[PDB]
Design a protein around this ligand. Structure first.
Ligand SMILES: [Cl-]
Ligand SMILES: [Mg+2]
Length: 282
């Protein structure tokens, strides 16, 4: 079946709803933020796969996230997030490999990462970043896994350049159109067309642009699915055209307001279900 709906969940770490909420909503699939280090063993992975099995839920992607990452503002994100910052790089690379091990024990084919703010290709740290990415891709390949880059601050052109430089068959994209509005970088539907051949999974999330003069400086604003500037019908109709049949994974990050987060997941589910019926005929 095309476009099974999903929600982005957390066991402990991360901004997703708990699995019990995915169950209540009766979604068939989830993406999962990887658990904290102490909850990451093989015995934990086997318990988690048993829990998803009992719930009738398939885990499509397991996402990395790390201590010391801060999204507080755009400059802090560039400074603290992903594999890019030098201080935390070795530690986060090793963590992504443990997350790959955990995903393998769980039986999940893919892991995902916001790699951070990718340097200009002329930069000396660019090449080092390519080399750690290739290294992580080898580790994942040995598990039969793909790595999906989460949509970042990079323009679609820069991202394509990076992907082309890494040049590995198991590297792909988790496409998040709201992120490009939040960073204020470029029109998300146009970027989707440009990167189409690398898209392996997606997030359905919405956002409002920052004021014109504040783009790339102040964050835009994340809002309930369909109430923002993405164009949900435009996004889904374009996904259909490029051949994407995989899960539509709803992401709404307001775990601080669990009740409203669940409400927005439920209205998102209704909106996507109607659009799926119209566009995909199911
Ligand atoms: Cl295209
Ligand atoms: Mg996302």
């Amino acid at each position: 079946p095309y476009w099974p709906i999903g929600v982005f969940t957390s066991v402990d770490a991360g901004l997703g709803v708990h699995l019990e909420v995915a169950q209540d909503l009766k979604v068939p699939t989830v993406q999962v933020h990887a658990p904290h280090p102490h909850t990451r063993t093989r015995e934990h992975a086997q318990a988690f796969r048993a829990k998803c099995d009992a719930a009738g839920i398939q885990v499509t992607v397991i996402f990395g996230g790390f201590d010391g990452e801060s999204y507080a503002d755009i400059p802090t994100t560039a400074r603290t997030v992903g594999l890019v910052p030098l201080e935390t790089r070795a530690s986060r690379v090793a963590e992504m490999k443990e997350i790959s091990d955990f995903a393998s024990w769980v039986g999940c084919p893919a892991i995902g990462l916001h790699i951070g703010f990718v340097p200009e290709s002329s930069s000396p740290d660019y090449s080092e970043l390519v080399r750690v990415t290739q290294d992580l891709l080898t580790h994942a390949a040995n598990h039969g896994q793909a790595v999906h880059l989460e949509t970042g601050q990079e323009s679609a052109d820069h991202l394509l350049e990076f992907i082309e430089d890494v040049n590995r068959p198991n590297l792909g994209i988790n496409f998040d159109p709201a992120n490009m509005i939040l960073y204020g970088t470029g029109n998300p539907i146009e970027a989707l067309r440009k990167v189409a051949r690398y898209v392996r999974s997606i997030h359905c999330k919405d956002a409002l642009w920052a004021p014109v003069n504040e783009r790339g400086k102040s964050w835009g604003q994340e809002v309930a699915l369909g109430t923002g500037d993405v164009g949900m019908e435009a996004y889904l109709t374009t996904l259909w055209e490029i051949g994407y049949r995989g899960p539509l994974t709803i992401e709404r990050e307001i775990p601080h307001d669990p009740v409203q987060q669940k409400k927005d997941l439920a209205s998102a589910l209704e909106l996507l279900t109607g659009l799926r019926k119209k566009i995909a005929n199911c």
